[PDB]
Assembly symmetry: C7
Homo-oligomer: 175 residues x 7
């Protein structure tokens, strides 16, 4: 028992121009997501693309690959948080086109990074990655580096409204 067929449902979502990041982020997810984003831009570089995010996070470099692809394509991107968006998941959520970042009412949003890496790396390198995340979160939340760094220190989740206040998303909708 695996995937149903419709009048494949995940292919159906791709016809809707929906890209799913609904799990832990690794290099395989990144490749699949990136391949889909470039394909949808080709079908149309003006029509919006929709990203469904239900991820606890994952590999940083895998997440930044998706982010860079989101920034590369010309399409407006509507991000949708369902379930949760934690760590790199919340970075992709905040990277949506301004005005088009949404969450469902009961989602949980976390920008705190966990205590991840394809290979072992040095202290100076984890900190360079961390600082890249600070700049991206700052860019898209309109918050200063300081309040980003301090907020990412708190090991906690935000509600959709808190995330809206903080600048991670724009709209919280029930229907």
């Amino acid at each position: 028992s695996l995937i149903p067929i419709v009048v494949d449902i995940y292919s159906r979502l791709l016809r809707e121009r929906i890209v799913c990041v609904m799990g832990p982020i690794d290099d395989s997810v990144a490749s699949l997501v990136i391949a889909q984003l470039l394909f949808l831009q080709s079908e149309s570089n003006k029509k919006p693309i929709h990203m469904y995010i239900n991820s606890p996070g994952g590999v940083v470099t895998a997440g930044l690959a998706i982010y860079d692809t989101m920034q590369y394509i010309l399409n407006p991107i509507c991000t949708w948080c369902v379930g949760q968006a934690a760590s790199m998941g919340s970075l992709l959520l905040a990277a949506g086109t301004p005005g088009m970042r949404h969450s469902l009412p009961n989602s949980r949003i976390m920008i705190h990074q966990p205590s991840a890496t394809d290979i072992a790396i040095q202290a100076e390198e984890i900190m360079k990655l961390k600082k890249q995340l600070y700049n991206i979160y700052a860019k898209h939340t309109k918050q200063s580096l300081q309040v980003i760094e301090s907020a990412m220190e708190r090991d906690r989740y935000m509600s959709p409204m808190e995330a809206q206040e903080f600048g991670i998303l724009d709209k919280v909708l029930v229907h």
Copy 2:
């Protein structure tokens, strides 16, 4: 190991009947699957009822809340049906059905008590577990019409309800033995 074929694919057939199955433990991939089916069925007709079959011991809370938010999101009425059991997040989805359209078979077991803990994708702090718990208190109260204190006390009891008890408590609306007609 083989999923039989009909006059094609039994589970594709249920989906043509607008039937979605939550028939096991709930995790992120189940939620991904259910959610996609609900949004698909809505697009075929946003007024025609959808039916959700629930035989689940529970699972990941955020995955269950993902399904719950999608249930409340779509315009369709939703009939929930409990066969076997609806425990933990399973009973939440059962109680989240359209009022008057929440059913159980006669011998099912319903539990709103949450398990002591794999209801998390990643380990979390004490304060977050409590925020999630209160989210559940509010949802059970919203759909059962019981007060917070009644829900909080009831969820502290490690027990299952019978369908008739679940009906009196406001979790479901009718217990069926045979089809009306």
Copy 3:
């Protein structure tokens, strides 16, 4: 090596309106049996449905889900025991339509419940007992035996012959060839 093709045999059985409970019972089996039963009722709610049972038991709640579905649908249900029907398997066997519960001559039938899968999640003493009582009532309903008779019999760790099962009220007919 795995499942030939008729000119799929299990899909052929489903054309015959045959449903298979041929292994241990869990939520996955229950979901598949239930989907088939409802599908067959829609093709026709009067044509008999046939359930083949060769099972050592399984999850109680999953077995009750099948049982409830059997009782829900309009179709008459012929139950056939090949090999054995143990624990929840004998409950489904006994739940067939009166006069339509069968067994092959050398099958083994046990209504004794094993000690201690059994449940999907761990449960309290009171819950295990409430499940046991649901079995008592079902067995009493379809065998026409009193509760005390059921409770005492289910306390014996033994198997029955098809004949003993007929005398006890679990099945109606024991057959060697097409009756």
Copy 4:
């Protein structure tokens, strides 16, 4: 191993009305064999069915499920022992239509049952004896040997040659080349 294609080689064998019981016998093998036997009966309830046996034995109840099915259907059944027919395997071999039970020349036949298990769930001492006595009666029925003879023979932990199995009543003919 990956089956080739001519259409699948095993679906081709089913068109020839050949059912294979190769390897150990469990509930899944039984459900499959039974389904094939009932299917072949429907295609023609008089045409012989052929059963190839290369098995070391297996679950008793599963073996009896196949056996009862063999006795249920109308069709004649030819049994062919290739390699070995041990324990429940030799019971299916011996349950073929009288006169249509065969073996290749170098096969090994054993009616002795294996110690311990053969069982889907653990069982009491009285039940295992009940099942054992069922096997005595089946072997007695088709070999035309007495219960005492069967009980004593199954106590010996040994195999038979095809000709010993013929003289004992398990099979009817040992073939080296295609009969004409």
Copy 5:
């Protein structure tokens, strides 16, 4: 794993009437080989059947199953040893139709049996199987039982020419005629 398509390589060999015993021998291999042999006979009980052998051996009863099917069918059977034919593998190689048992130049051939298979069996039984192997080898090589028993006692491989002298095969070929 990644089996290429030819406008299925292993089904192409079956069209050529080639059966493969290309690994260790167990009941599943025997079911397949036997099914293919009977299929090929039915398409023609006169045309030769070819058996490619690169096997280290395996289950005795499984190997005897194939052997019996080889002797059963009417077709002449050409056996071909590529790589190695050890234990039951060498028996199948030797069971080929007289004059049609071949090997490539660098193959290794062993009639020595390895020191469980099938199920746990008694001492008398394993000896009965061993005696069945002696007789088979003695039939197809034309050696006496004494010669067979002593040769199977040596833990060693033969070259194709040694196996030719011994009677296990008839032709050692480098290239086609």
Copy 6:
């Protein structure tokens, strides 16, 4: 779930003349990449081929197999670093056609090799020297610069990769 269908998604990329080196490099990855490179050349020995690299590295000989095929085929090869190009990954990135080596803004490049198929000390060193020569050929740095730089256990940004000669362009938008 597995891969989606469009009209498979990676077969679509191949129709675009895109080859993916999107994970750790091993022999199986090498044989697949190689076959796609030779196939694309047959389709056309003149149309650019694009290589997407998100790799932490892998087997050296496997990576050199890919590198040699890149240098063999006549096509211009455009390399694109997304996420990271580390160890052999950064070598294939630098092996692109001059002027056609790219990276997205937040990628990480590392030419340091990892400390680690059961070979002798002389052979590990022979292999390392081959990497030096290759990096020196395509970055236009001298060997001493390559050897000292590969000693540092660090990652480069795309911009320092550019000034070092690993890539040519850092793109943000089309």
Copy 7:
């Protein structure tokens, strides 16, 4: 990996008469390679076959199985070393048709055998018999003396393509399409 489709990549290579030996060699690989070689011979007895070799070695008897098939078929065989050709891999590389044995510039070639390979454990005399067969094969195709082969295979080392050329393992090292 997930094999892509073109309008299967490895079946496209086989239509080019390319057979791949791109990993460790075992009876499974040999069975497949042999089947491909005999199929391509029937497509044309004389058209060259191409063999891509990126292998660390494998079972000796499996390797000799492929080698015997290579010498059996009438087709000329072009060998192409990419990545590496170690132990039995280098034997297959060296077994190509004289003048048609190739390597890319950065490949590594090793004729030294490993110490551990064995379908079934064997005696000491047998493993030396096999070793002698490898000696004779390498001698035949490199045109070196047995003594030269025996000494070289002691040295636990890899050769460069140009060093394999002057030893007689291959004939051409090329960078771009000739």
